[PDB]
mmCIF file of C-alpha atoms in Angstrom:
data_model
loop_
_atom_site.group_PDB
_atom_site.id
_atom_site.type_symbol
_atom_site.label_atom_id
_atom_site.label_comp_id
_atom_site.label_asym_id
_atom_site.label_seq_id
_atom_site.Cartn_x
_atom_site.Cartn_y
_atom_site.Cartn_z
ATOM 1 C CA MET A 1 18.709 12.744 10.353
ATOM 2 C CA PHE A 2 20.235 13.776 7.035
ATOM 3 C CA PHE A 3 19.301 14.329 3.391
ATOM 4 C CA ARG A 4 21.354 12.694 0.636
ATOM 5 C CA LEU A 5 21.813 13.473 -3.061
ATOM 6 C CA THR A 6 19.967 11.300 -5.554
ATOM 7 C CA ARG A 7 21.614 10.558 -8.907
ATOM 8 C CA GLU A 8 19.339 13.105 -10.602
ATOM 9 C CA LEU A 9 20.366 15.828 -8.147
ATOM 10 C CA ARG A 10 24.087 14.980 -8.270
ATOM 11 C CA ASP A 11 23.949 15.360 -12.052
ATOM 12 C CA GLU A 12 21.688 18.396 -12.105
ATOM 13 C CA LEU A 13 23.537 20.342 -9.397
ATOM 14 C CA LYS A 14 26.522 20.597 -11.747
ATOM 15 C CA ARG A 15 24.421 23.329 -13.381
ATOM 16 C CA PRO A 16 24.753 26.778 -11.746
ATOM 17 C CA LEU A 17 21.986 27.709 -9.294
ATOM 18 C CA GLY A 18 22.530 31.334 -10.291
ATOM 19 C CA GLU A 19 24.350 33.366 -12.929
ATOM 20 C CA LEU A 20 27.916 32.205 -13.547
ATOM 21 C CA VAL A 21 30.530 34.980 -13.454
ATOM 22 C CA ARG A 22 33.646 33.941 -15.335
ATOM 23 C CA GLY A 23 37.310 34.901 -15.669
ATOM 24 C CA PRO A 24 40.503 34.174 -13.674
ATOM 25 C CA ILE A 25 40.618 35.174 -10.014
ATOM 26 C CA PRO A 26 40.095 37.830 -8.975
ATOM 27 C CA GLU A 27 38.091 39.094 -11.951
ATOM 28 C CA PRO A 28 34.728 37.426 -11.031
ATOM 29 C CA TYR A 29 34.839 39.125 -7.625
ATOM 30 C CA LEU A 30 35.640 42.499 -9.203
ATOM 31 C CA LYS A 31 32.690 42.022 -11.536
ATOM 32 C CA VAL A 32 30.140 41.446 -8.748
ATOM 33 C CA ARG A 33 31.726 43.843 -6.261
ATOM 34 C CA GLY A 34 29.005 46.389 -7.045
ATOM 35 C CA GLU A 35 26.202 43.929 -6.279
ATOM 36 C CA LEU A 36 27.943 42.940 -3.028
ATOM 37 C CA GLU A 37 27.917 46.593 -1.963
ATOM 38 C CA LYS A 38 24.116 46.671 -1.789
ATOM 39 C CA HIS A 39 23.127 43.347 -0.319
ATOM 40 C CA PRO A 40 24.062 40.977 2.542
ATOM 41 C CA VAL A 41 26.377 38.219 1.297
ATOM 42 C CA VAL A 42 26.762 34.555 2.248
ATOM 43 C CA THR A 43 29.934 32.864 0.958
ATOM 44 C CA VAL A 44 30.287 29.091 0.551
ATOM 45 C CA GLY A 45 33.870 27.812 0.187
ATOM 46 C CA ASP A 46 37.279 28.975 1.429
ATOM 47 C CA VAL A 47 38.351 30.462 -1.913
ATOM 48 C CA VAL A 48 35.073 32.368 -2.351
ATOM 49 C CA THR A 49 35.203 33.670 1.239
ATOM 50 C CA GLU A 50 38.849 34.702 0.869
ATOM 51 C CA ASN A 51 38.274 36.597 -2.383
ATOM 52 C CA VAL A 52 35.176 38.342 -1.040
ATOM 53 C CA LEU A 53 37.080 39.505 2.049
ATOM 54 C CA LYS A 54 39.938 40.650 -0.182
ATOM 55 C CA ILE A 55 37.754 43.126 -2.104
ATOM 56 C CA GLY A 56 36.615 44.651 1.182
ATOM 57 C CA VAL A 57 33.278 42.875 1.712
ATOM 58 C CA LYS A 58 32.341 41.214 5.018
ATOM 59 C CA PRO A 59 29.989 38.201 4.573
ATOM 60 C CA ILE A 60 27.228 37.968 7.172
ATOM 61 C CA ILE A 61 27.883 34.219 7.005
ATOM 62 C CA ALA A 62 30.919 32.416 5.623
ATOM 63 C CA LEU A 63 31.060 28.622 5.316
ATOM 64 C CA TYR A 64 34.319 26.801 4.663
ATOM 65 C CA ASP A 65 36.373 23.750 5.575
ATOM 66 C CA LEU A 66 37.378 23.385 9.231
ATOM 67 C CA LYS A 67 40.839 22.416 7.959
ATOM 68 C CA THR A 68 41.210 25.618 5.914
ATOM 69 C CA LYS A 69 44.419 27.522 6.491
ATOM 70 C CA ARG A 70 42.574 30.803 6.836
ATOM 71 C CA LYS A 71 43.669 33.724 4.659
ATOM 72 C CA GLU A 72 42.870 37.448 4.469
ATOM 73 C CA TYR A 73 43.116 37.537 8.263
ATOM 74 C CA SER A 74 41.334 40.664 9.486
ATOM 75 C CA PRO A 75 41.780 41.606 13.187
ATOM 76 C CA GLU A 76 38.255 43.041 13.146
ATOM 77 C CA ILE A 77 36.840 39.724 11.903
ATOM 78 C CA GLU A 78 38.888 37.588 14.300
ATOM 79 C CA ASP A 79 37.549 39.628 17.203
ATOM 80 C CA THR A 80 33.988 40.374 16.062
ATOM 81 C CA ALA A 81 32.880 37.235 14.189
ATOM 82 C CA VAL A 82 31.185 34.222 15.774
ATOM 83 C CA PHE A 83 32.957 30.949 14.937
ATOM 84 C CA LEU A 84 30.786 27.833 14.802
ATOM 85 C CA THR A 85 31.551 24.298 13.638
ATOM 86 C CA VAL A 86 29.457 21.429 12.291
ATOM 87 C CA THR A 87 29.967 17.991 10.757
ATOM 88 C CA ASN A 88 28.500 17.486 7.288
ATOM 89 C CA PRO A 89 29.667 14.481 5.200
ATOM 90 C CA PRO A 90 30.033 14.846 1.386
ATOM 91 C CA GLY A 91 26.822 14.610 -0.641
ATOM 92 C CA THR A 92 24.612 15.267 2.392
ATOM 93 C CA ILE A 93 22.725 18.038 4.115
ATOM 94 C CA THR A 94 22.604 17.091 7.799
ATOM 95 C CA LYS A 95 20.037 18.462 10.239
ATOM 96 C CA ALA A 96 23.039 19.751 12.192
ATOM 97 C CA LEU A 97 23.974 21.883 9.161
ATOM 98 C CA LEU A 98 20.401 23.149 8.751
ATOM 99 C CA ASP A 99 20.262 23.996 12.469
ATOM 100 C CA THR A 100 23.646 25.751 12.438
ATOM 101 C CA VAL A 101 22.824 27.869 9.377
ATOM 102 C CA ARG A 102 19.516 28.903 10.979
ATOM 103 C CA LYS A 103 21.330 29.786 14.217
ATOM 104 C CA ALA A 104 23.816 31.776 12.138
ATOM 105 C CA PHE A 105 21.105 33.858 10.465
ATOM 106 C CA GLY A 106 19.704 34.581 13.930
ATOM 107 C CA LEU A 107 23.092 35.945 15.008
ATOM 108 C CA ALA A 108 23.306 37.940 11.765
ATOM 109 C CA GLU A 109 19.897 39.487 12.485
ATOM 110 C CA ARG A 110 21.448 40.830 15.682
ATOM 111 C CA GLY A 111 24.428 42.410 13.950
ATOM 112 C CA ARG A 112 26.919 39.533 14.286
ATOM 113 C CA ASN A 113 28.826 38.048 11.344
ATOM 114 C CA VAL A 114 29.300 34.267 11.548
ATOM 115 C CA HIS A 115 31.884 31.828 10.200
ATOM 116 C CA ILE A 116 30.831 28.177 9.999
ATOM 117 C CA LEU A 117 33.790 25.790 9.808
ATOM 118 C CA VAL A 118 32.483 22.557 8.350
ATOM 119 C CA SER A 119 33.984 19.141 9.027
ATOM 120 C CA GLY A 120 33.327 17.313 5.762
ATOM 121 C CA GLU A 121 31.883 19.259 2.818
ATOM 122 C CA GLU A 122 30.199 22.675 2.961
ATOM 123 C CA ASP A 123 29.283 22.716 -0.736
ATOM 124 C CA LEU A 124 25.587 21.938 -0.361
ATOM 125 C CA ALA A 125 25.129 24.630 2.305
ATOM 126 C CA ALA A 126 24.127 26.998 -0.503
ATOM 127 C CA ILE A 127 20.740 25.258 -0.280
ATOM 128 C CA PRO A 128 19.957 26.083 3.413
ATOM 129 C CA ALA A 129 21.673 29.450 2.962
ATOM 130 C CA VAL A 130 19.018 30.327 0.380
ATOM 131 C CA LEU A 131 16.169 28.804 2.387
ATOM 132 C CA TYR A 132 16.833 30.698 5.620
ATOM 133 C CA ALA A 133 18.288 33.964 4.272
ATOM 134 C CA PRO A 134 16.522 37.359 4.280
ATOM 135 C CA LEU A 135 15.068 38.265 0.883
ATOM 136 C CA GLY A 136 17.685 40.057 -1.217
ATOM 137 C CA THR A 137 20.624 38.212 0.367
ATOM 138 C CA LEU A 138 23.287 37.099 -2.105
ATOM 139 C CA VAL A 139 24.754 33.599 -1.874
ATOM 140 C CA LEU A 140 28.109 32.978 -3.604
ATOM 141 C CA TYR A 141 29.776 29.632 -4.269
ATOM 142 C CA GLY A 142 32.608 28.497 -6.529
ATOM 143 C CA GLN A 143 32.165 26.547 -9.764
ATOM 144 C CA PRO A 144 35.623 25.013 -10.365
ATOM 145 C CA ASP A 145 37.254 25.840 -13.708
ATOM 146 C CA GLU A 146 34.441 28.258 -14.594
ATOM 147 C CA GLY A 147 34.168 30.849 -11.822
ATOM 148 C CA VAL A 148 31.693 32.099 -9.230
ATOM 149 C CA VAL A 149 27.944 31.532 -8.918
ATOM 150 C CA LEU A 150 25.747 34.322 -7.554
ATOM 151 C CA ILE A 151 22.279 33.540 -6.184
ATOM 152 C CA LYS A 152 19.853 36.362 -5.421
ATOM 153 C CA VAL A 153 17.495 35.199 -2.692
ATOM 154 C CA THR A 154 13.996 35.778 -4.041
ATOM 155 C CA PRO A 155 10.699 34.069 -3.055
ATOM 156 C CA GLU A 156 10.874 32.110 -6.318
ATOM 157 C CA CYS A 157 14.416 30.945 -5.580
ATOM 158 C CA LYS A 158 13.519 29.817 -2.054
ATOM 159 C CA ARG A 159 10.638 27.870 -3.586
ATOM 160 C CA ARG A 160 12.986 26.055 -5.960
ATOM 161 C CA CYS A 161 15.657 25.328 -3.337
ATOM 162 C CA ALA A 162 12.891 23.896 -1.144
ATOM 163 C CA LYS A 163 12.099 21.559 -4.038
ATOM 164 C CA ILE A 164 15.751 20.511 -4.280
ATOM 165 C CA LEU A 165 15.716 19.614 -0.581
ATOM 166 C CA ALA A 166 12.340 17.886 -0.935
ATOM 167 C CA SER A 167 13.856 15.855 -3.792
ATOM 168 C CA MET A 168 16.739 14.477 -1.728
ATOM 169 C CA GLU A 169 16.698 11.067 -0.040
ATOM 170 C CA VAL A 170 15.681 11.190 3.635
ATOM 171 C CA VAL A 171 17.889 8.990 5.829
ATOM 172 C CA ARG A 172 17.195 8.041 9.438
#
């Protein structure tokens, strides 16, 4: 079972799902660093994860490409984080991804940070990240050639991400 982007969604998802923080790396991360200090953070993408680590913030969940040459190595993270993997083809949200993200939030509830190494494309994981996150969680993803998108997980935002999912094609 997987969901697939419709043409409407593919177009419309080019628009930020939160406020867009601009400027050359690492300036966007500096600019949100204060927000990240309060709230739990989920990072989607290797570059986002790397730059969040670099400014001294540990994501509760980080999603990035299985084939990432991993940067900002922290011994603490290597030893303390749970490493999961999942296959998720471009333009899809697979059940496997939904299940893995839910698992991950479970682990996070119990004081464990989680890295999900995705075979395929992790981009759309921002959707399940929002849906399953504790209220007040921040979800960050990269908007190429523009900067970083910050989603604050509110009831309203969950509602709207649920609509995005409900608007995708169901396949098998």
